[PDB]
Structure 1
């Protein structure tokens, strides 16, 4: 379904460039439920990630229309914003593919 396409479980990651290491976003190992939400009132999209166990929000960001979203592997996607690199480590290839499709749709909307 469309709404099911708009979320997926993944570990949210950030890249420590100085030490060349991927680390958990928010410092919290584990998967989050990662959603793309269409905030229609101001015509924005947000990516919101909340940890599956403790339910802490680890990412909550507006998607910029010029985002370069890279599908680096079958289960790991990444993007930059502000020289800060974020990643999503999906639990499965199928969920990675559906979330990518959701992101690409959001970017199409934001650029029309």
Structure 2
């Protein structure tokens, strides 16, 4: 049972450490609709994004308590897990604000 707490437009990127380059998540350049989903049973939150064109899930990652969410610019935000670096290149500042708000809220209530 998952409730969407936000939707934002972004091109989801992951960092290729070996080549020191951002690459499109899922291998597919383009914009996705990126949700934060809240599972109320255990108060968990995940980032789940699907490409606008073909619906591919290109990101599905946990939001752990204590995450450092970096707002590098008004339209490019990023964070890390133990394996990967993620970046969201938002379609607008408004989308970056919506998503950052929801993320920051999740991080306050975890």
The interval holding the TM-score normalised by the smaller chain is: over 0.9
> Cα distance, 1:3 vs. partner?
8.8
- Decide which moves more: 4-13 or 21-30: 4-13
Which deviations, in whole Å up to 9, do the C-alpha atoms of 1:55-100 show, x marking residues without a partner?
0111111210111100001100000101411000001111101110
- TM superposition score normalised by structure 1: 0.91
Distance (Å, rounded) in 2 between the aligned partners of 1:75 and 1:42: 31
Ranges of 4+ aligned residues in structure 1 off by more than 2 Å: 1-5
How many angstroms apart in 1 are the aligned matches of 2:68 and 2:17? Answer: 18
SS at 2:10 equivalent: strand
Q: TM-score if structure 2 supplies the norm length?
A: 0.92
Structure 1: stretches of 5+ with no match in the other structure: none
CA distance in 2, matches of 1:25, 1:10: 11
The count of residues paired between Structure 1 and Structure 2 equals 110
Q: Which has the higher helix share?
A: 1
Aligned CA-pair RMSD: 2.8
Unaligned runs of 5+ in 2: none
